[PDB]
Amino acid sequence: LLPKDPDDERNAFLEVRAGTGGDEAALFAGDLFRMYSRYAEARRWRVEIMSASEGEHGGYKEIIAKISGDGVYGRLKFESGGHRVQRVPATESQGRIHTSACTVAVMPELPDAELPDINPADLRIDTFRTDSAIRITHLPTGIVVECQDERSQHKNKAKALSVLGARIHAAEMAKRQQAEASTRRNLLGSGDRSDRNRTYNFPQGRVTDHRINLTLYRLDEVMEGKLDMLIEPIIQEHQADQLAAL
RNA sequence: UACCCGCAGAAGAAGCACCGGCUAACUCCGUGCCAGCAGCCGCGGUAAUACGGAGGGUGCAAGCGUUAAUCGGAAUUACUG
RNA sequence: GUACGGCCGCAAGGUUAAAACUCAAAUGAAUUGACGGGGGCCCGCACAAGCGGUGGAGCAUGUGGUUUAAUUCGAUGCAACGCGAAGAACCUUACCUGGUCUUGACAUCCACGGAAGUUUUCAGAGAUGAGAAUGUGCCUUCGGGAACCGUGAGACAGGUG
RNA sequence: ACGACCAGGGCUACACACGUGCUACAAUGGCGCAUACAAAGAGAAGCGACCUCGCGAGAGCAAGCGGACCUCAUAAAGUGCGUCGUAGUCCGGAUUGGAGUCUGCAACUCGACUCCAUGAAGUCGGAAUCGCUAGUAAUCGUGGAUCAGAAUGCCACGGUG
RNA sequence: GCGGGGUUGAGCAGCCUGGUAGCUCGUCGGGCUGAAAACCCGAAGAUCGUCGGUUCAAAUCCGGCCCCCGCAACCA
RNA sequence: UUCUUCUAA
Ligand SMILES: [Mg+2]
């Protein structure tokens, strides 16, 4: 009955990087990615890693994936933000609590047909080491998306453009939503993609949201993909933001 | 005018600060190195006497705090010293 | 001991000498320690002297990793790794997949209704579903209870969380 | 329901990586026959002779012994002879087919063992690294617990040295 | 416009008159260390830029192209 | 002869 965001039914391009705190966050970049792998397989969604980058110490410097299926952006759009891990390092033999965090970007599946204002004069495309590596740079936004992991040039080009065109959608629809003042009533959270949304205390096994301040000692389950325990009450409060302003 | 006389009924009249230590005075609940606190040492990194609330208590009192400000403590420019 | 200025110098620079700022310390000796690619001493299959073995092979066994609906969990320098576990076909099993159950398997309390209990048929993977003969061991100025089943009420249980 | 019960699963998966073992790469050996020699334990439905039958795994009889009595119980390395003749071998045994045996509701996952066939790798192992100072190392058997069944493990025990 | 070259990941040898893919580090894995380095040990990886031809056979020889790299774009 | 380093209750 509620007027919904029509990009919710789109799928999700996904962008995870390493964060602050050292290898712990870079591990925690790789640690979170297994959960969404468990989640999207539980959600019967196809995980498609478009590009990946470790810190070569067991932790991912970054990773770009696409998760596709049924209403994938409508379940993952809330996740974009800071997410903190609290644990004890293995090189520490005293129990000094180091803390680290990571950065999340969730974008709708935006086709280039749904991107009419794309312009190759507004693009800068680099081909390097038949050369298979593709670096596409969107000139008015400065958005640079590389793809080199495929064996051929044509496969890397569409993969570097689709994430970039999603980042054009990620830039512009954020710049449309932050411009609209009364539309943010139907919005759970701040609307910026930088809030420390959820803290992971591992010795407590604690999952603690911060936008609704929902605390769970269910981390072992959640890390293995029991995440609709969290995503659904977010939407229940997100649509409570939608219903109470109507 | 001061002042004096009766008049009504407990009637018409109490608060602010603080309680980890220094420093008199504490428990409980929320809270979780967040929110905050803070003169100093310092708290909050789930069991907070230090955060917020409750009660309870301390201390002043029609004020109570805060800040600014000057000397003091400082023999910390030392004549004393 | 720096900036600026003065001073001096052939120059190098010297000399005179700040403040903004920032910290809640800085330092001094001395003490117990620890540590030393310091010194001295002593001891150790520590080295030396010896013997065999591992690492190569195959397999057992364990962990990691990976995988899994699940591969239950713990132990991971020495001092985890044929460890927990002196022995996972089921059981174990703590895990998965379904099937189920809720004063609950169980403790005790509390009534209530059948003495228990005895044999059986069928459904069902089984957890269970009605059939189905009974008994009166116990006791009583005898709810038929207690033993022992079932029902109910909550007290609570339970948890290898 | 992080509680209770049932079946089935899984705890045994599998590119790998490591630990720890076991068995090898042979002639001081292999194989065959003959023969010598323990110690310590275990045992009542037990240990189960004895004989029977089965190539054997076993099956049946069923003594005997709660055990300084009987059973387990024949120690093995060895000794003696024969044989193999320096080879992937009469080394070595992986794997796999077949066919059983036993256990236990039940051996698909997922058992142990027998028989037949099969006969990988392996011809002393890089950098490295381990153990051990005498009955020790080395090497050879035996037993025990755990245990329905099921140990190259663990715990003992002797032999040689 | 003309010359040059395009080679395991990388940077490069060999490119030899065509029967012929080496190096080094990197990588991977062990060893060493309490750990990381360093070092040691062991591993693997190339269709020789491209489209073709000549050839018994092309990295090789040849031709065209892609890429650059050099060079030259003069005299009033 | 040679011989470096150890984030953060
Ligand atoms: Mg090792």
Side-chain angles (χ1 to χ4, degrees), chain A residues 54-124:
Chain A
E54 292 180 354
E56 288 188 353
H57 59 276
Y60 281 163
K61 166 153 193 201
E62 68 183 0
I63 189 165
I64 295 170
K66 185 180 182 181
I67 293 173
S68 294
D70 299 332
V72 181
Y73 181 71
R75 296 283 188 176
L76 298 177
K77 58 182 180 178
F78 300 100
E79 298 295 326
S80 297
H83 289 274
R84 185 174 67 190
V85 64
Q86 297 182 358
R87 61 186 176 183
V88 173
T91 187
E92 185 68 30
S93 63
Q94 298 175 355
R96 292 180 184 269
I97 297 175
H98 185 72
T99 307
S100 296
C102 284
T103 65
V104 182
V106 174
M107 302 180 289
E109 188 186 11
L110 190 75
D112 290 330
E114 286 289 328
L115 188 66
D117 54 355
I118 190 167
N119 192 0
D122 291 333
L123 289 175
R124 185 177 182 270

Side-chain angles (χ1 to χ4, degrees), chain A residues 154-166:
Chain A
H154 183 76
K155 293 179 181 180
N156 287 314
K157 186 176 180 180
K159 290 170 72 178
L161 188 62
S162 67
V163 178
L164 180 140

Side-chain angles (χ1 to χ4, degrees), chain A residues 16-19 24-33 59-61 63 102:
Chain A
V16 178
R17 295 182 184 92
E24 305 295 325
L27 263 61
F28 182 64
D31 294 334
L32 292 172
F33 181 72
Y60 281 163
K61 166 153 193 201
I63 189 165
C102 284

Side-chain angles (χ1 to χ4, degrees), chain A residues 99-211:
Chain A
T99 307
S100 296
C102 284
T103 65
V104 182
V106 174
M107 302 180 289
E109 188 186 11
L110 190 75
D112 290 330
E114 286 289 328
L115 188 66
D117 54 355
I118 190 167
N119 192 0
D122 291 333
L123 289 175
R124 185 177 182 270
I125 301 168
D126 287 328
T127 301
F128 63 99
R129 177 67 177 172
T130 302
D131 294 331
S132 64
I134 294 299
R135 178 181 297 115
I136 298 172
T137 294
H138 188 271
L139 295 175
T141 60
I143 286 168
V144 183
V145 173
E146 294 181 354
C147 188
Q148 66 183 358
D149 293 334
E150 300 294 327
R151 296 292 300 274
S152 65
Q153 183 176 2
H154 183 76
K155 293 179 181 180
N156 287 314
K157 186 176 180 180
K159 290 170 72 178
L161 188 62
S162 67
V163 178
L164 180 140
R167 286 181 68 190
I168 301 303
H169 191 82
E172 182 67 29
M173 292 298 289
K175 287 175 183 179
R176 286 182 180 177
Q177 188 177 4
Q178 291 176 355
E180 291 175 352
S182 65
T183 310
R184 293 178 292 173
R185 295 177 184 176
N186 306 323
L187 175 62
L188 181 59
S190 63
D192 193 2
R193 291 182 177 178
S194 65
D195 185 75
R196 50 179 69 182
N197 290 320
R198 189 171 293 167
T199 299
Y200 286 157
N201 195 359
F202 286 176
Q204 293 182 357
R206 186 179 64 196
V207 172
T208 301
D209 193 353
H210 298 287
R211 292 177 294 172

